Design a protein around this ligand. Structure first.
Ligand code: ADP
Ligand code: ADP
Ligand code: ADP
Ligand code: ADP
Ligand code: MG
Ligand code: MG
Ligand code: MG
Ligand code: MG
Lengths: 372, 372, 372, 372
C-alpha cells in the first residue's frame, strides 16, 4: 500500500516499523559477525556471515563489528546487508512500494548523507525519501513546540534549542560521549579487581552488566565515603559460565564520566554545563521558556538518578529567581521513532518528499536543498 | 452609525477610538516584525508578519521596525497593514460607514499628507476626512482659548502660540528631540558599566527601564555631587533572563540632554529657551497672557520633576515683575485624543468635512485648501 | 603716507581699501567662529578663534556668529578682533599713520557711534576720523546732486530724499527687511519639501542657494499659475555632500516678502509704497525731479527683475502725466565704498576731519556736533 | 634612562618596545597555560604555569587560556604574570625607572581602566602613566590629521571620525566581530568534511590555517558558482601529525561573515555599512574629506582582497559625484605601536603625563580627568 516506513538505525541499535503505529515492530542490534575458527564438519557451517540476533546468539565463534561509529558510517558494504535484512527478513515487505524516512545526527559529513540517499535510491528503488534530524522528532513525540532537547545514545550527544518552531542553528552543540565510552571505562575499571575482559563477547557481557546494575549518585563525595565505610552497596552478577562477580563502588563511577569527562582523558564540560552554555547563547527573551521545558530522550538517559542529579546541577548555575523543570517520560527510549511516525502521517507532509523524478533530474546533491 | 472615529497615530504609539467618549479604546505600539531564523517544524510558524502586541510578545525571534520616523512616514506598505489591523482586528468596524479624523505634526512635507489622504480615500473608502494639528487639540482638551502649547512624544517637539483662537504661524518652532534619542543616549551610557545592549528587543528593554526609573534633577551640579558623595541614589532592576542590574547617577542624566542638547552632539537650545524665544517673537501686548498659561502635553513630559525644573528655568529668563505658571494635568498623556474627540462632536464641525465628491471632483491636492 | 582709508563694515560683509582707488582691496564676511567639539590630537588645533575667510572655510566644526545685527553692534569684543584682522592681516598697514572713514546707517543709537569713535581713537590711535551716512555716498558714486536713494543690504532698508545737496531729514524712512529675513524665510519654506536645515553652516548653504537661483516675478498670480501648470521653472542644485536638490515655485517666493511683508508676519508696506510715501512727504515743487531720478544701491537690490517690477509698481501709484525712471548701475554692489573714496579725496574735505586734539580736548561726545 | 616604553596589549597579541624606535622589540601572544596530565618523573615537570612562547611550544599537555576577552580583562591574576614576564623576561628592564604608555579600546567599562592604573602604579611603581585610544594613534602612524579610521583585531571593531584634530565622539561605532569569531566559524564549517577539531591546540591549528590560506572574494555568487563548477580553488595543508587536508570553497566563506554577520547569527550590518552610517552621522561639510581618506589598520584587515571589496561596496552606497579612496599600508599590522612611539617622543607630550604625586594626592579616579 501507500503506508510509509520508519527506520531509525543508531550507533548500536536498529528500530524499524510501519507509519501510523505507536511502537516499533522490529528492534535489533546492528552488528555483523564472521567466523574465525576452522570448520571440520562436512557442512563446516551454513553461511559465512551473520547479521542481527543470530550473530549475537552465536557470538562465541564470531567476530562482531559495528558498521556505524560516532554516528558516521565507516563500512559501506555491511550497511547494505543490514538494510536488506531489515527490509526482507524482518518486515517481509517490498521496498519498491513504500516511502522511507531516515534519521541522521546533526553536524555530520555531507558525503555520508549523499551516499546514503544514492544507495537507497539506486539499490532498493524506493519511490520517496526524506532525512530528518533526530532531536527534532523528540518534540513531536512529546507534543510541544518550544524547549531544548537533549539526546544521548551509542553515537553522539547533541543539543538543539527550538522556540515555537524556529530552531536556532548557531547554538547547536555536539559531544562524543556515549554508551561505548561508558562500557569501555567500565571494562578498564573492572580490571582493578581480578576480572579481566578482552573479547567482543566479553564487551557485550560488560554492556549487559552496565545496563543491569548501574545508577547515578546525587553527591559523589558522600557516596564514595558511604561506600568506603559501610560497604553495603555491593551487588552480585552471574556470568554465563557459572561464576559470580561482585561490584561495589564501581556502580556509580561509570556514569560519573558523563558529568566529569576528565575521567576518560577528554577535555570538555559535562552535560550539565553544555546545556547551560547552549541556553546562554540564545536570545535574552526566550531564555526563561527554554529553562522550564528541558526534554530528555535516548537510551543513555535511562539511568535512575539522572533527572534529579541534572536538576540539582542546573539549578546552581541558573539564577534563583526562576524555576528549572526536566521532562523525562518513562518511554523516552523509543522517542525518535514515535516522533517520526507522527510526522510521516501528517496531512501537510505530502509535498515535502523527494520523488525519484527530482533525484534523476537533478542528482544526488538534491538532499542538501530539501532537508535540514 | 454616523459616529466619527479618532485615530492618533504617533511615532511610537497608536490610539484609536470612537468619538464622544473620554478615553481611547485601543492603544498599542506601531511596530512591524518579521522572523529571521529558520523554521524546522512542519508548520514552521503560522504567518510571515506580526503587527501590534503579538509582534512585541514574540519579539525574541523577530526584527521589529517602526514605519514612522521623526514624524514622517518612510514605509508606505506597513502603514496599510497597521491601519487594517486597527480598523478590523482592534475595533471590529467597517471603515466605509464612519468619518475618520487624523492628526499630523506641523512643518511636515505636503507629499506625506497628500499620500495619506489619497490612500485613505481609495483603499478603505471612508466617506469623510479631516486632518488637524496635534498641538491645537491640546487647548480643546484643556478647555482654554489662549496659551502656548508644548507637546513632546516619540516624534518631534513643537510649540505654537495661540491667543483667543488666532494662532500665530510665524512663531512656530520645531525640534527633533524625542524618546528615541533619550533611549539611544541611555543605551550608550549604559555601556559605561558592564551591561551591553545591541538588539531591538534590548532596545525595548532599555525603553522600559527608562520609563520605570528616571527623573529630572532640579540642580544638576548639586545632584551630581550628592550622587558621587553619598551613593544613595542607586536603584535595582530585574532583567527577563533573571539577572539584576544597578543604576546610579544615570537616572537623571537621561532627561538632561532634553535641557542641554549638546550631550548628543546636537547644536540647539533646550526646551526652556525655545519657549522663551517663541514667546518673545509674538506681540508685546499678548506676552503677559501666554507667560501665565503654559500648557504641557505628550508622554515625554511625564517625568516627575519636569514641571518645577522648567518653571525655575523660565523664571530666570523672564522679567521678575509678572508670574509664570505651568499647567500639567495628570492625564496629559492622552490629551490629543481627548481634544480630537471633543472637536469631532461639535455642532459647528459638520460642514468642515472633506466629502468624497470634493475629492473626486478636485483631486488629492484639496487637503491643502481645507486643513491648517 | 597721508593716503586715507575707507572701511565699509556692513551687517554681513566688510570692504576695506585705500582712498583714491576705484575698487575695494579686501572684501570678506564679518563672522567670528569658535570650535565646539573635543580635541584629541597633541595639537588639538592651533587657535581658539577664527575670523574672516578661514572661519567659513573650517565652518564644519565651528559656531559662526555675527557681531552686527540690524545695523547695531551687539558684541563689542569681536569687533576689535575683526578690525585688527582688517588692519593687520588684510592690508598690512599701521593704523597710527592714516585717517579712517566709517559709514553708519541713519536712525541708530548715539551710544553706538560714541563707543565706535571712543574705541577707534583709544585703541588703534588713528589721527583723524569721520562718520558719514551710507545712502549719501550713493549719489557721490553716481555723480548726481538730486534724487531719492534706496539702499538695501544685510542690515536695514532706508530712504533719504536729497535735492540739490539739501537733504530733508523729516522724510527719512527706515525698515527692517534684509537678506537675513529672506534667507530665514527660504529656510522655512524649504522644509515644505524633504530638505531640512538647522545649522549655521546650513544657513550659509541656504544663503548661497538664494544668491544663485532666485529672481523676482513681474506678476505674482500669473507666475504662480504657470508654475503650477507647466512645471518648467524647476532648477537643480548640488549640495557639498553630493546630493542634489530641486526647487520650483520657491524661486520667486523668496523676494516676494520684500514687496509683501505680511508673509513673514511683519505689518508694514513694501519697498514700492515706502518710496512713494517718502516722495509725497516732500515739497510740491521738488516731487517731479525726485520721481525721475530713482537711485538703487546695495546687494539686496541685485535681483534680475527688481527694476521692472518696481517701475511697474510705482507707475500705478504716481499720476500718469509725468515719467518714472529707475537707475540701476551694474556695479551697484560696491557703490557706498566708491562714493566714500571719491569724497575722501576731495580738496574741500580737509578741514572736516576730527583731529585727536579736538577729541581729547572736548570728549567722545564731539561726533554729534561734526557728523550728520 | 628616561626613555619611555610602549606596550600594546591586544586581545590576542602583546607588542612591547622602547620609544623612539620604528619596530616592536618583543611580540608574543598573551596566553596562560597549565598542565592537566599526571607527572610520574622525579621532577614531574619544572613549573606549574607557562606564559608566552613556551606555553604554545608545550601546548600539547597544557590548557591555554586568554586573560582578555572582547577587549575587557576578565582574569586579573594572569595579567600580572603576563606583564611581569614582559617587563623582566622579555625586555630586561626595571619598571621603576621608565614611563609607560598603554592603549585601550573605546567604549569600555571605567572599572577596567581604574583597576589597570591602580595595579600598574602600586605593583610595578612606574613614575608616569598615560592611556590613549588605539584608533587615534593610527593617524599619527600614517601622518595625517583628518580621516575615518577602521581598526580590527582579536577584540572589537571600532570606527572614530577625526577631522583636523577634532574627533566627534557622538559618531563612534563599536562591533564585536574579530579573529576569534572567524576561527570559530572556520572550526564549525570544517566539521562539514571529515575533519574535527575540539581542543585548544586544535583551535591554534585552525587559526594558523586561517592565517595561511584565506582570502576575500570580490563577488560571492560568482565565486561560489566557479568553485562548484571548476573545483580548481582547492588547497592543501599539512597537519603536524603528518596527515594532509584539503579545503575548497571554505577559503572565502570565512571572511564573508565579516561582511554578512548573519552567518554567525549576529543581528547587525557589515563593516561596509557601519563606516557609511558613521560618515552620514557627521556634518555635511566634512563628509567629502572623510570619504576620500579611509584608513585601515589591524591584523584582521590583512586579507588580500579586502581593499577592493570594501571600495566596491562603499562606492555603491555613496553618491557617484565624488571619489572614494582607501589607504592600506603594507605595514598596517604594527600601526598602533608606531603611532604610540611617535606620540611618546613629542616635545609637547611632557606635561600630559600622570605623575605619582597626582595619583597619591587625588586617587585612582584621576585617569578619567586626564585621558580621552
Ligand atoms: N536500562 C538502562 N540502563 C542503562 N543504560 C541503558 C538502559 N537501556 C539502554 N541503555 C543504553 O542505551 C544504549 C542504546 O541507545 P539507543 O537507544 O540504541 O541509541 P541509538 O538509537 O541512537 O543508537 C545502549 O548502549 C545501552 O548502554
Ligand atoms: N511614565 C513615564 N515616564 C517617562 N517616560 C514616559 C512615561 N510614559 C511614557 N513615556 C515616554 O513617552 C513616549 C510615548 O509618547 P506618545 O504619547 O506615544 O507620543 P506620540 O503619541 O506622539 O507617539 C514613550 O516613548 C515613552 O518613552
Ligand atoms: N547676485 C545676487 N543675487 C541675490 N542676492 C545677492 C546677490 N549678491 C549679493 N546678494 C545679497 O546681498 C547681501 C550682501 O549685502 P551687502 O552689500 O554686504 O550689504 P552691507 O554692505 O550693507 O552689509 C547678501 O546677504 C546677499 O544675500
Ligand atoms: N596574514 C594574515 N592573514 C589573515 N589574518 C591575519 C594575518 N595576520 C594576522 N591575522 C589575524 O590578525 C589577528 C591578530 O590581531 P592583532 O594585531 O593581535 O590585534 P590586537 O593587537 O588588537 O590584538 C590574528 O588573530 C590573526 O587571525
Ligand atoms: Mg538515537
Ligand atoms: Mg503626540
Ligand atoms: Mg550697505
Ligand atoms: Mg589592536
Amino acid at each position: 500500500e501507500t503506508t510509509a516506513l520508519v527506520c531509525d538505525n543508531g550507533s548500536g541499535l536498529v528500530k524499524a516499523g510501519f507509519a501510523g503505529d505507536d511502537a516499533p515492530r522490529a528492534v535489533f542490534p546492528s552488528i555483523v559477525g564472521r567466523p574465525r575458527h576452522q570448520g571440520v564438519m562436512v557442512g563446516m557451517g551454513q553461511k559465512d556471515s551473520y547479521v542481527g540476533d543470530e550473530a549475537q546468539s552465536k557470538r562465541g565463534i564470531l567476530t562482531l563489528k559495528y558498521p556505524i561509529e560516532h554516528g558516521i558510517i565507516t563500512n559501506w558494504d555491511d550497511m547494505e546487508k543490514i538494510w536488506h535484512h531489515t527490509f526482507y527478513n524482518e518486515l517481509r515487505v517490498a521496498p519498491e512500494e513504500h516511502p522511507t524516512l531516515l534519521t541522521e545526527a546533526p553536524l555530520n559529513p555531507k558525503a555520508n548523507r549523499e551516499k546514503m540517499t544514492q544507495i537507497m535510491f539506486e539499490t532498493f528503488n524506493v519511490p520517496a525519501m526524506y532525512v530528518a534530524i533526530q532531536a527534532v522528532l523528540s518534540l513531536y513525540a512529546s507534543g510541544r513546540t518550544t524547549g531544548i532537547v537533549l539526546d544521548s545514545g551509542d553515537g553522539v550527544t547533541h543539543n538543539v534549542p527550538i522556540y515555537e518552531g524556529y530552531a536556532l542553528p548557531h547554538a547547536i552543540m555536539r559531544l562524543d560521549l556515549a554508551g561505548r565510552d561508558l562500557t569501555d571505562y567500565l571494562m578498564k575499571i573492572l580490571t582493578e579487581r581480578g576480572y579481566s575482559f578482552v573479547t567482543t563477547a566479553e564487551r557485550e557481557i560488560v554492556r549487559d552488566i552496565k545496563e543491569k546494575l548501574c545508577y547515578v549518585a546525587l553527591d559523589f563525595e558522600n557516596e564514595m565515603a558511604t561506600a568506603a565505610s559501610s560497604s553495603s552497596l555491593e551487588k552480585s552478577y552471574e556470568l554465563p559460565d557459572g561464576q559470580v562477580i561482585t561490584i561495589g563502588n564501581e556502580r556509580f563511577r561509570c556514569p560519573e564520566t558523563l558529568f566529569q569527562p576528565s575521567f576518560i582523558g577528554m577535555e570538555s564540560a559535562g552535560i550539565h554545563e553544555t546545556t547551560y552554555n547552549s541556553i546562554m547563547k540564545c536570545d535574552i527573551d526566550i531564555r526563561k521558556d527554554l529553562y522550564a521545558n528541558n526534554v530528555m530522550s535516548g537510551g543513555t538517559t535511562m539511568y535512575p538518578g539522572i533527572a534529579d542529579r541534572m536538576q540539582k546541577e542546573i539549578t546552581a548555575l541558573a539564577p534563583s529567581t526562576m524555576k528549572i523543570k526536566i521532562i523525562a517520560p518513562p518511554e523516552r527510549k523509543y522517542s525518535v521513532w514515535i516522533g517520526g511516525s507522527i510526522l510521516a502521517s501528517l496531512s501537510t507532509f505530502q509535498q515535502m518528499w523527494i520523488t525519484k523524478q527530482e533525484y534523476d533530474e537533478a542528482g544526488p546533491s538534491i538532499v542538501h536543498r530539501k532537508c535540514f
